[model samples]
Target: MEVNKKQLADIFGASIRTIQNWQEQGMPVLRGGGKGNEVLYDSAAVIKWYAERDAEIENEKLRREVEE
Candidate 1:
């Protein structure tokens, strides 16, 4: 269930730098070794994070629509 940064980037259609930025932004990354060469994340956890984020985005859109 764990994936490296590159694999994660490819899966999400993002760049490696974006993945690194997410790590910096508290996106839940587990580093074992490689000092930046080996960044790991749990796939299920990532998915859950995205699901929550998407929900928040949807709620915000709904709230905005309600206001205007």
Candidate 2:
């Protein structure tokens, strides 16, 4: 199923602004992208993407620590 930006934010326990930021950061969107258009996202896809993003960030942190 798909959800709008606000719903997706609520699902993730984040703010709508964070969702918007995710949109810019390449989060998967099922549809909707235009002025006055509501963005849609598949929860399953978002969850998977979120997990991947978190892993990437964690890996980056580890890499930085190793470098330091």
Candidate 3:
């Protein structure tokens, strides 16, 4: 279940650049790389990243509500 950045971003409704930024920020996920080629990410990794991102966002929202 290999996928490129564009495909993954499209699936998540994110810009390709945003996905690249996520990877650049050291998401602690693994991705395959090659000479002069776009890094390929495992589908499982993508799902994990998605879940982590959404969970973080949800937690932030909850904290904000509590603060109000």
Candidate 4:
């Protein structure tokens, strides 16, 4: 499923800027508009991105423990 910025923000209980920040933080976006860039996101991609991000974070945590 695809969702626009407003809908996506609502789903996450966040503001538009939060979604924008997520994008900056590496969230997956399906398309970008010119001004607001008509930002759109794919649910599947977003889920996949989170899964990968979570794994990366877990790896970092483990690495930190090993180093410590």
RMSD for each model, in Å, please?
5.4, 4.8, 4.8, 6.0
Ten residues in sequence with the least summed lDDT for candidate 2: 53-62
Against the hidden reference, what TM-scores do the models get? 0.57, 0.69, 0.56, 0.55
Model 4 per-residue lDDT tens digits across residues 1-68: 78888877665555667667667788888886555667687767865875666345435446769968
Put down candidate 2 lDDT per residue, 40-59, tens digits, no spaces. 87877877997778345435
Query: Candidate 3 overall Cα lDDT vs. reference?
Result: 0.61
Better TM-score candidate (3, 4)? 3
| Residues 1-68 of candidate 3: C-alpha lDDT, one tens digit per residue | 66677776665566676667666755433444554566776657676776777345335446869968
Q: Which stretches of candidate 4 lie over 4 Å from their true place?
A: 32-37, 50-68
On lDDT, the candidate that comes out on top is 2
Specify the highest-TM-score model's number: 2
- Clash pairs of candidate 1? none
lDDT of each: 0.64, 0.74, 0.61, 0.67
Provide the clashing-pair count of each candidate structure. 0, 0, 0, 3
| Backbone-clash count (model 3) | 0
